């Protein structure tokens, strides 16, 4: 059915080649077309290297597909809804499992999707807000992050948290078109003090690097 | 300071954010050596090569003229530990300098030398990788250019023996397509 299908076309009129495989939304822009300024970027940018000439002939941008984000969101909503009884330590397990489920899989593509970052932030805030509801308070001074983010070895909940990161925001009018870059940041979540929290994404190795590493490791192994 | 850097870097997605987080804090500048020493150590010490920690070191250079200097220094500081570091982390480095040098944060190389005289089998591997990465980007032709205008000597000479060590060694690396002129010179 044409309705479910999708088509993209590369021709002298169309530089960009879009497609969707598995969960990944992929764009491909050659350097033989108008790439203008050649530049690097976060690992969300893959370099497509000619096997013959060992040259970087194009760039593939990754983006986390819509339906995927939808599935994750329904998974969080599953955690909130399906548990009214269950213990608070148990929910945090549910969160952690789902969250690494997203992050180990997507990795690089996550950082180039702003919609995800938003969704994660609001969802962390929803499960923590729910645990708050669990006792009776919403009062922030009664739930500093030390209680949620302590590894339960010391008696916290051991919550894996990706959502204290800053969320890049620039120029909606232009950002809907030309990919302007980052002129601003929005605060994802609160911190009692200046403080900090570590992000999962920083501790996971990107897919590109683990691929190259794989090839090298095997060859050296032989 | 050393601990704050780590926390700011482990926190941030992207490489852009860590610099913003770091600059924002407005930590004292002179330390702008050791900080960067921090980044080079912090990821390289970190288990496997990751694109992020290498980019960060570089941007931190373009923003202030000194940061660039701070890096080139830190590359020098390697000579002492060229032998000493264990044979994984060379796998992070070789590339990791590969990505500062492909993108122009080359002639700083020259300081590095090929001799059985003094090169650490460590250092041997270090440089080995460094080329097997940087090549894979420039693709061995643009590299032909960059070298041909480089005037890198301690690498590329006298010492017909050391021309056997050089050229041979780049048959071992395998690239050995930038070793031609030297082959002629042997003759």
């Amino acid at each position: 059915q044409w309705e479910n299908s999708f088509v993209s076309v590369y021709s002298k009129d169309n530089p960009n080649l879009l497609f969707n495989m598995c969960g990944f939304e992929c764009r491909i822009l050659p350097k033989c077309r108008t790439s203008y300024e050649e530049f690097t970027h976060k690992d969300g940018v893959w370099n497509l290297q000619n096997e013959v000439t060992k040259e970087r002939t194009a760039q593939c941008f990754l983006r986390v597909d819509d339906e995927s984000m939808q599935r994750f969101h329904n998974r969080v909503r599953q955690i909130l809804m399906a548990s009214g009884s269950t213990t608070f330590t148990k929910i945090v397990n549910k969160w952690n499992t789902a969250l690494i489920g997203l992050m180990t899989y997507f990795r690089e593509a996550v950082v180039n999707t702003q919609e995800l970052l938003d969704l994660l932030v609001k969802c962390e805030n929803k499960i923590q807000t729910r645990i708050k509801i669990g006792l009776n308070s919403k009062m922030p001074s009664r739930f500093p992050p030390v209680v949620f983010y302590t590894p339960k070895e010391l008696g916290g909940l051991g919550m894996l948290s990706m959502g204290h990161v800053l969320i890049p925001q620039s120029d909606l009018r232009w950002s809907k078109q030309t990919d302007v870059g980052i002129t601003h940041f929005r605060s994802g979540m609160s911190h009692e003090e200046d403080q900090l929290i570590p992000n999962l994404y920083r501790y996971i190795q990107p897919w590109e690097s683990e691929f190259i590493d794989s090839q090298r490791v095997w060859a050296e192994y032989a | 300071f050393r601990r704050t850097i780590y926390l700011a870097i482990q926190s941030s997605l992207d490489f852009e954010e860590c610099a913003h987080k770091l600059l924002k804090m407005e930590f004292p500048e002179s330390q702008t050596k050791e900080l960067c020493n921090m980044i080079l150590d912090c990821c390289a010490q970190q288990r496997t090569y990751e694109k992020f920690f290498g980019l960060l070191a570089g941007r931190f250079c373009m923003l202030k003229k000194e940061y660039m200097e701070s890096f080139e220094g830190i590359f020098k500081e390697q000579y002492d530990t060229i032998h000493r570091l264990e044979t994984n982390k060379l796998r992070n480095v070789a590339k990791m300098f590969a990505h500062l040098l492909y993108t122009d944060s080359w002639s700083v190389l020259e300081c590095i030398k090929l001799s059985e005289e003094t090169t650490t089998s460590s250092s041997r591997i270090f440089v080995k990788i460094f080329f097997q990465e940087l090549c894979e980007y420039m693709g061995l032709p643009k590299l032909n250019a960059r070298l041909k205008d480089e005037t890198l000597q301690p690498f590329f000479e006298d010492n017909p023996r050391n021309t056997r060590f050089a050229i041979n060694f780049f048959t071992s690396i395998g690239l050995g397509g930038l070793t031609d002129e030297l082959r002629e010179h042997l003759k």
């Binding site: 932030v121 120029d171 002129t183 605060s187 | -």
Partner: peptide, 26 residues
């Protein structure tokens, strides 16, 4: 000046809506 940036209102957002400018831009 909300220059088309930030949320319409930090109501459902999970945040405090705080937008400071990118301190490292260029």
């Amino acid at each position: 000046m909300y220059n088309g940036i930030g949320l319409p209102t930090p109501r459902g957002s999970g945040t405090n809506g705080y937008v400071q400018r990118n301190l490292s831009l260029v």
